Design a protein around this ligand. Structure first.
Ligand SMILES: [Mg+2]
Ligand SMILES: [Mg+2]
Ligand SMILES: [Mg+2]
Ligand SMILES: [Mg+2]
Ligand SMILES: [Mg+2]
Ligand SMILES: [Mg+2]
Lengths: 197, 137, 234, 171, 72, 191
RNA sequence: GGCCAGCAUCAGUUUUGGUGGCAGGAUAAAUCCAUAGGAAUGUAGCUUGCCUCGGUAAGUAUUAUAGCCUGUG
RNA sequence: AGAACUGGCGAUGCGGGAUGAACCGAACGUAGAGUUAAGGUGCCGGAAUACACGCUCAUCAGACACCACAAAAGGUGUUAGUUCAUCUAGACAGCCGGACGGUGGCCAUGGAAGUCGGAAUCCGCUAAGGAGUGUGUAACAACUCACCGGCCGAAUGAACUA
RNA sequence: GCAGUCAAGCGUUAUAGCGACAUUGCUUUUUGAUUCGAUGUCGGCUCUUCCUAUCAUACCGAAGCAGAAUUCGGUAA
RNA sequence: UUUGCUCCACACAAUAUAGAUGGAUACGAAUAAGGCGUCCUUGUGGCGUCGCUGAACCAUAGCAGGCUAGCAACGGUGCACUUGGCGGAAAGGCCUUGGGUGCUUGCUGGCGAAUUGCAAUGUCAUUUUGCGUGGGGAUAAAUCAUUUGUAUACGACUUAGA
C-alpha cells in the first residue's frame, strides 16, 4: 500500500524475486531493490559460473559492439533476469520497467527508509536445507565486477551508523513502554481493553 | 566456572499429550490432543471439549503449542476428555498471550462503527495522559 | 550402492558349519559317559606342537577343544539342563580357551603331570618381560646380539620396512644391510609388554617365557561333585 | 479417487435342469460401484471361465471400517503385470483404515514403481495383530516406546506479497 | 575455463515427424515378427507375509474339500 | 531411509571445557584453546552432563548421518589436541647432496628453508602455520619434529614440507632423496 | 419531447450465497454405556542388585493409584 | 516392395500444439449473455508460487516425439522390492592367538624347502590348518589368507528386479 | 566376411529355438628374405574466423624410466 | 539585438498526464536460531518474556472542518525566525537550542449549516524559464572571415591576431 516499496534483496532467490517484482511493475507498483550483491541463486557456484560463461560466449560474430551486452554487476544480473520476464519492446513494458530501480548496497536516501522482504522468494523459506546456493557478489566478482570491496566498506560504515540509530531508538522505545505500562490500571485503559484496544 | 555449556535450542515435540491448534478445515481455531503418532507427517488427534472429532490429520494442518499433559497412548475419547479436564488445558491456554492475541483480533473484528468512534475518543484521552506523564521523564 | 566389496580368494579349504559343533557336542556327551574324571584346562596362547605333545603323552585319554559356549552347552548350562548331576559348576568354571580332559588315570598322576609340565614360549603382550633386550649399535643381526655377531647371519634387507614402520625402530640400509645409529632398548626386565614389543621379541626369536597348563577343577563320575585343583593359577 | 471397499457377489445365469449356480464373492477397492462391478467381472473372467454376458451381479455392498479411529499396522500383499510375468510384492503401511492404506499403496506404486490402477492387483490386506510381526524398519521405527521427535525449520505461509519483518523458522 | 558449445534441446518438426514414421514402421515389423517367429511360450506366496501358515492351512483345507466335492 | 533420529556421543575428560553456540565449538584444555566452525552441517548438540555430549540429526539421510559421524570425529580430535597434542616426526634422506634445513624469519613469519635438494640452487620456503612448533631432533640424524594442538595444521604443514621436495623428471626407483613423515603420535608420553 | 442517467415492481436467460424438511446403507460404521475374556511399546504393588538422601537397571504381577485390544448386547 | 478396404487433405476458415500440408479440438450469417472442448494456470500470458503422497542434484539434469544411439552394457549414486543363505550351543566389521606332524612328498635345477617349473595331490592329529592364496629369499627365514579359536554383542551377507 | 565351437543369459518340462563375452579355420607361413578401367568436377593467389579428433610449446601419470633420448596416456585451442 | 540577465519577499494570474486522495513507519546477523527486559563474576553467562504475521503501530470527531464562553494541565502540534552538532555512495537530509505566534477533541457549553432539491470526480495537494510591485547583486563569450601546420579528401584538429 506504500507509494514506493523498498525491497532488501539479501537472502532472496533471483528468479522468484524477479517474477514477483515484474508482476508488481506491470500492475503499476513502484519498486526499489537494494543490496543486490547479497542475492542468491540455487545450485552450486561452478554451475552458475558455467551458465554465465555460456552467456559470455553469446556475441555477434561480425561486430561485437552490436551483440548481446554482458553487464557484470549484480544489480544488472538481476535486471536481466527481470527484463526477460517483462515484454520490454512495447511501450507498456518500457513503462513498467521505468517503475523499477536496482542498487548495490543501500545508497541515500533509501538508507533511512523502511525495507521489506518477499517471503515467497526467500531462500530459507524456499530451499530445502542442505542444497547448495550461490552468492551474487562472488559470482559477479568472478565474472569481472570490480567494486565488491568498495561496496563492502561503504556498507560497513552504513551498518555502524544504523546501529547507533537503533540504539537510540531502542532506548526511546523502552522509555515509551515504561511510561505506557504504568497507566494500564486507569479506567480509560480498562475501557480500551474491553473494546479490544 | 569449569563446566561445559551447550545451547539447548528447545523445540515443540510431536508426542502423545501434545496440545495442537487446528488452523484450517471444519474445526479451524480449536484445540485438540495428540493421541497416537502414525508416521512422520500424520498423527491422530482428539478434541472432545471443543467438539473436534477423533481423526487422523496431517501435521501441516495444525500448529503445535507449548502446552502438554499426561495422556496414555491410544486413549479413547472419554479418557482423553477426563485427562483434559484434570489437567485444565483450556484455562492454561486462555492464560497465554497467544490466545489473548486471538481474542483481541476477534473482538476488534467484531467492533462496530460507534464502538470504533469510542475507541478513538478513549485513545485520545489515554494519549493525552501518557504524553503528559512522559514529558516529565 | 556405495558398499564395501569383499575380497575374493580361491583357496582349497571351505568354512565349517553347525555340523562340526553338533559333532563336538555329541563327542563330549559320549565321553562324559565313557570316562570317569573330567578336568577343565586353560591353554591360552598354546602352540600346536605343544598341544600335540600333550595329546601324545596322554595316550588313552581324551582332550576336547572347541568353542567354549559349545562345550558349556554340552556340559549343561544350568541344573535343569545338565547332562549329569552337579555338572553346572564344571560348566560355569569354563573360561577362555577351555579344554576338557576325559580320563580314568589317577588324580594324583594328573596333578603331578600338570605341575611338572612346562615348555618355553614366546613372550605375550600384557605379560611380564622375562629379560631386557637392547639391539646393539651397527649392523642389525638376525638374533640381535643374543649369539655372537660373527656366528649370526645378518638380518635380511626385506624386513627393513617392517622394522621401520611396524616396529617403529629407526633403521637405515647401508650396502644392503640394516643398521642403527645407536643401541635401541626395546623391553626392560619386569615390565608390561605391548603388542609391538611382543612382535619385536618374536621377530628376534627370544623365547624366555614359559608355558604352564592351568588346571581349574575336575568332576568325578561316582562322587558327582566338583573339586577345585588350583594348579598354576598364580 | 478416495477409495471405498465393496463386496461383490455374482453368479452364472441359471440354466435349464442346472438351477441355483454357485455364488462367488470378491472384495474390491474402487471409487464407485460402476468401477467395482467392472473390476469384479474382469477378475472373474481372469480366474474362472465366466463372462459378463453369461453372468449377473447378485449383490454389491459397501464395507465400512470396523474401528476407523484406531491406528493399525497393515500388511498388503499385491501383484502387478509385467512382460516377464506376475510378480508378488509385500508392503507395510501404518494407517487407521483399509481404504486409506490402499490409497497410500497406490500412490507409492505411482511414485516408485511407475504403476497404474488397472495394472495393480490388491490380493490381500491384513492387520498385523502383534507388533513383533512387523518386519520393515520404516514402520518399526514408529513403534518405539515414548516416541518423540521435533519438527525443525518450520516454514509459515504468508498471504501477503511483502513482509515487514524477517521471518523465523523456530518451532 | 573455456566453456564448450551446448547441444540444442529445441524440438525439430522434421525430426519429430520422422520419429513418428520410424516408430510406426518399427511397430509393424515387431507385429509381423511376433506373428512369424517360432518359440515356445503364479509366483506363490511372498515370504515376507506374516500369515503364510494360515494361508497354507486354508489352501490345504480347500484342496482336501475339493478332492471329494467332485467325487461324491 | 529417513531415520527418525540418529545420534553420536562425545566424551569429555575432566580438564576440558567445551562451549557450543550456533555450531561454533570452543574447546579449552591444559594445552590451550581450539575453535571450529560447523555451520555447514545441520546438527543439534545436547549436553546431558559434564562428561558426555550428544550430537543428533532428525529425519536425515545417508549423507546427513555421514556428516554426523564426521562432526563427532572432528570434535574428538579437538579434545585430543587440547589434552595431549599432536606430534609428527619427519626424516630427510639424500644420496649425494646434503639437504640443509633451517628456520628463518622473514618479517617475523617463521619460514622453513630447504637448500641443496639434489644440488639445486633454488631455496625452497615453507611457511610455518600458526600454532605449530618446529624443532630439529636430538640424537636422531636428519629429523624434524612438528608439534601442536591442531592435527589439521600439523599434518598440513608436514604435507607441504613433503611436497616442496618432489623429484622431477627422474626415475624415483633410483632417486630416493626427499623429506618423508616417519611417525605420527601425541606430545604427551606419560605411558 | 430530444440527450444521459438513478431507483422500484416484474418477465426471459444465467451466476453466486444462506437456511429447512425428508429417504436409504450393517434401518451407516463409529464415539458412548453395559458385560465377558486377553495381552504389552507392562499401570499400581512386591522382590533383589546397588544407584545424588529413591529416581532408576530386571524378574514377577493382567487394573490395582494409568490405560489399551477383541467378542456380545 | 506388391494387393484389399476405410479415413484425412486439394475447394477450409476458427481454438490449441511457441512457429507448420496432413497432430489434438472444432467446421464458419450479424451480435449479446452464459458454459465448455483441446490445451493450460511462476512471469512474458487470461487462469491456484493450490492442496496431498513419493522420487531426483546432473562440472551445461529435466520439462520430447515413446523409434534409434541401447550392449536392459558400465557406476563404491539413491530408493523400493524378490529369492536364497548365517545368527546368544553368538550376525557383519575389528584386534589378538593358533595356523601343526610324516615333509626339505617325487622328478628336474648351480641353487628351488607350499609359492621359476612337470605330474601325484596322500595320511595322521585336530577347534582348524592347502603337499598351499600372495608378498619375500640365491635358497631357507619372516609375514600373510584359506580355516579355527579368544574379546566384543544383534542383526547380516549374496544373487537378481524396478 | 563366411563356416564352426563354447556358454553368462533368454526360452521350456517337449536336452526345440535365440544368444553377450570369448575362440578356431581360410584369407597368410615360419630364420627379419625380396603400378591392372575413380565416366564427371579440380588446384592455386589474397585474407578472416571457428572446431579439437593436440604436431610443437605449458603442467602432469605410467613403463627396466640410471643419466641423455624416447614410447603410451591425461588436462589443455 | 529600443534596459538585456539573475536570484529574495509580496499582491493578480494560470499550473500539478504510465496515473496523489491519512503516514514509503530506517538495526545488524542467524534460521538445527533469534528479539526484548533484567541481574551479575560482562560471558558462546543466569533468570523472565515474545513470535504462531502489518488483522500491526502511529494518526484519525469540528462550515474539506466556522464564530465565541469556560474548566483542567504546563503537555501535544503547525508556521516563520533562531542556537549548535552530524551526514559525500547519488551527501541535499537527520538531530537539537531559545523565544515568538497560532491551534488543541484532555473535559464542559452556546450560536451557524438547509434549496447541490433522492446520486452524478462534484473539482480541495507541490511546482510556476508569464507577467505587475519592488529592496539588492554582475557587467561575457562563441562562430564565420584572416592566419599556423604538430593536422587534414571535405568537415574536423592544432596555433596566432584589438
Ligand atoms: Mg572488460
Ligand atoms: Mg429475475
Ligand atoms: Mg495472470
Ligand atoms: Mg551419434
Ligand atoms: Mg581433448
Ligand atoms: Mg459544530
Amino acid at each position: 500500500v506504500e507509494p514506493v516499496v523498498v525491497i532488501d534483496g539479501k537472502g532472496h532467490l533471483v528468479g522468484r524475486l524477479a517474477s514477483v517484482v515484474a508482476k508488481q511493475l506491470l500492475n503499476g507498483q513502484k519498486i526499489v531493490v537494494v543490496r543486490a550483491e547479497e542475492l542468491n541463486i540455487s545450485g552450486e557456484f561452478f554451475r552458475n559460473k558455467l551458465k554465465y560463461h555460456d552467456f559470455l560466449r553469446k556475441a555477434t560474430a561480425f561486430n561485437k559492439t552490436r551483440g548481446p551486452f554482458h553487464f557484470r554487476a549484480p544489480s544488472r544480473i538481476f535486471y536481466k533476469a527481470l527484463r526477460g520476464m517483462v515484454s520490454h519492446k512495447t511501450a507498456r513494458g518500457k513503462a513498467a520497467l521505468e517503475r523499477l530501480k536496482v542498487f548495490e548496497g543501500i545508497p541515500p536516501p533509501y538508507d533511512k527508509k523502511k525495507r521489506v522482504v518477499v517471503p515467497q522468494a526467500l531462500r530459507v523459506l524456499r530451499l530445502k536445507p542442505g542444497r547448495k546456493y550461490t552468492t551474487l557478489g562472488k559470482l559477479s566478482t568472478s565474472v569481472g565486477w570490480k567494486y565488491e570491496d568498495v561496496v563492502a566498506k561503504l556498507e560497513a560504515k552504513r551498518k555502524v551508523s544504523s546501529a547507533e540509530y537503533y540504539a537510540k531508538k531502542r532506548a526511546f522505545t523502552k522509555k515509551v513502554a515504561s511510561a505506557n505500562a504504568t497507566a494500564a490500571e486507569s479506567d480509560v485503559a480498562k475501557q480500551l481493553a474491553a473494546l479490544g484496544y | 566456572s569449569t563446566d561445559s555449556i551447550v545451547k539447548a535450542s528447545n523445540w515443540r515435540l510431536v508426542e502423545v499429550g501434545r496440545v495442537v491448534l487446528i488452523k484450517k478445515g471444519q474445526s479451524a481455531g480449536k484445540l485438540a490432543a495428540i493421541v497416537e503418532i502414525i508416521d512422520q507427517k500424520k498423527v491422530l488427534i482428539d478434541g472432545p471439549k471443543a467438539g473436534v472429532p477423533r481423526q487422523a490429520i496431517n501435521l501441516g494442518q495444525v500448529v503445535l503449542t507449548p502446552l502438554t499433559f499426561a495422556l496414555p497412548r491410544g486413549a479413547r475419547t472419554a479418557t482423553v476428555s477426563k485427562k483434559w479436564a484434570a489437567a485444565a488445558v483450556c484455562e492454561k491456554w486462555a492464560a497465554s498471550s497467544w490466545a489473548k492475541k486471538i481474542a483481541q483480533r476477534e473482538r476488534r473484528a467484531a467492533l462496530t462503527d460507534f464502538e470504533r468512534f469510542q475507541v478513538m475518543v478513549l485513545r485520545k484521552q489515554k494519549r493525552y495522559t501518557v504524553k503528559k506523564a512522559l514529558a516529565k521523564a | 550402492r556405495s558398499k564395501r566389496s569383499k575380497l575374493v580368494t580361491l583357496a582349497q579349504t571351505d568354512k565349517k558349519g553347525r555340523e562340526n559343533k553338533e559333532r563336538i557336542f555329541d563327542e563330549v556327551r559320549e565321553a562324559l559317559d565313557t570316562y570317569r574324571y573330567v578336568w577343565v584346562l586353560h591353554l591360552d596362547d598354546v602352540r600346536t606342537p605343544v598341544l600335540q605333545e600333550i595329546r601324545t603323552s596322554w595316550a588313552g585319554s581324551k582332550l576336547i577343544m572347541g568353542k567354549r559356549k559349545v562345550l558349556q552347552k554340552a556340559l549343561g548350562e544350568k541344573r535343569e539342563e545338565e547332562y549329569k548331576e552337579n555338572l553346572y559348576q564344571l560348566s560355569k568354571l569354563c573360561s577362555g580357551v577351555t579344554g576338557l580332559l576325559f580320563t580314568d588315570e589317577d588324580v594324583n598322576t594328573v596333578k603331578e603331570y600338570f605341575k611338572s609340565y612346562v615348555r618355553s614360549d614366546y613372550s605375550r603382550p600384557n605379560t611380564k618381560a622375562p629379560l631386557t633386550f637392547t639391539i646393539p649399535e651397527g649392523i642389525v643381526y638376525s638374533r640381535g646380539g643374543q649369539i655372537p655377531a660373527e656366528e649370526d647371519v645378518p638380518m635380511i634387507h626385506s624386513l627393513e620396512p617392517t622394522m621401520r614402520n611396524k616396529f617403529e625402530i629407526p633403521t637405515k640400509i647401508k650396502a644392503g644391510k640394516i643398521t642403527i645409529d645407536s643401541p635401541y632398548l626395546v623391553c626392560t626386565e619386569g615390565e608390561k609388554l605391548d603388542v609391538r614389543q611382543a612382535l619385536i621379541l618374536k621377530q628376534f626369536g627370544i623365547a624366555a617365557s614359559e608355558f604352564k597348563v592351568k588346571v581349574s577343577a575336575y568332576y568325578d563320575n561316582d562322587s558327582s561333585t566338583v573339586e577345585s585343583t588350583n594348579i598354576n593359577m598364580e | 479417487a478416495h477409495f471405498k471397499e465393496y463386496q461383490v457377489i455374482g453368479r452364472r445365469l441359471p440354466t435349464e435342469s442346472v438351477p441355483e449356480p454357485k455364488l462367488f464373492r470378491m472384495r474390491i477397492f474402487a471409487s464407485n460401484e460402476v468401477i467395482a462391478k467392472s473390476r469384479y467381472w474382469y477378475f472373474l473372467q481372469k480366474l474362472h471361465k465366466v463372462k459378463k454376458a453369461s453372468g449377473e451381479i447378485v449383490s454389491i455392498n459397501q464395507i465400512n471400517e470396523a474401528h476407523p479411529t484406531k491406528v493399525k499396522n497393515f500388511g498388503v500383499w499385491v501383484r502387478y503385470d509385467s512382460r516377464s510375468g506376475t510378480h508378488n510384492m509385500y508392503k507395510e503401511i501404518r494407517d487407521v483404515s483399509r481404504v486409506a492404506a490402499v490409497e497410500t499403496l497406490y500412490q507409492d506404486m505411482a511414485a516408485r514403481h511407475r504403476a497404474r490402477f488397472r495394472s495393480i492387483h490388491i490380493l490381500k490386506v491384513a492387520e498385523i495383530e502383534k507388533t513383533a510381526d512387523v518386519k520393515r524398519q520404516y514402520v518399526k521405527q514408529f513403534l518405539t516406546k515414548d516416541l518423540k521427535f521435533p519438527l525443525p525449520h518450520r516454514v509459515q505461509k504468508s498471504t501477503k506479497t511483502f513482509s515487514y519483518k524477517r521471518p523465523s523458522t523456530f518451532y | 575455463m573455456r566453456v564448450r558449445k551446448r547441444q540444442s534441446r529445441r524440438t525439430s518438426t522434421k525430426l519429430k515427424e520422422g520419429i513418428k514414421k520410424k516408430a510406426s514402421a518399427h511397430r509393424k515389423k515387431e507385429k509381423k515378427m511376433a506373428k512369424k517367429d517360432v518359440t515356445w511360450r503364479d509366483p506363490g506366496i511372498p515370504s515376507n507375509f506374516p500369515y503364510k501358515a494360515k494361508i497354507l492351512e486354508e489352501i490345504e483345507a480347500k484342496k482336501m474339500k475339493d478332492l471329494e466335492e467332485r467325487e461324491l | 531411509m529417513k531415520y527418525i533420529q540418529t545420534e553420536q556421543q562425545i566424551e569429555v575428560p575432566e580438564g576440558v571445557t567445551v562451549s557450543i553456540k550456533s555450531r561454533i565449538v570452543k574447546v579449552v584444555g591444559p594445552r590451550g584453546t581450539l575453535t571450529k566452525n560447523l555451520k555447514h552441517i545441520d546438527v543439534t548438540f545436547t549436553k546431558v552432563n559434564n562428561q558426555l555430549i550428544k550430537v543428533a540429526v532428525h529425519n536425515g539421510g545417508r549423507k546427513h548421518v555421514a556428516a554426523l559421524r564426521t562432526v563427532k570425529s572432528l570434535v574428538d580430535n579437538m579434545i585430543t589436541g587440547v589434552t595431549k597434542g599432536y606430534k609428527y616426526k619427519m626424516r630427510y634422506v639424500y644420496a649425494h647432496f646434503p639437504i640443509n634445513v633451517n628456520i628463518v624469519e622473514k618479517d617475523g613469519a617463521k619460514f622453513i628453508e630447504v637448500r641443496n635438494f639434489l644440488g639445486d640452487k633454488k631455496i625452497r620456503n615453507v611457511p610455518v602455520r600458526d600454532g605449530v612448533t618446529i624443532e630439529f631432533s636430538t640424537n636422531v640424524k636428519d629429523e624434524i619434529v612438528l608439534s601442536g594442538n591442531s592435527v589439521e595444521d600439523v599434518s598440513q604443514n608436514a604435507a607441504d614440507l613433503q611436497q616442496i621436495c618432489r623429484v622431477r623428471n627422474k626415475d624415483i626407483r633410483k632417486f630416493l632423496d626427499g623429506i618423508y613423515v616417519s611417525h605420527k603420535g601425541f606430545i604427551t608420553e606419560d605411558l
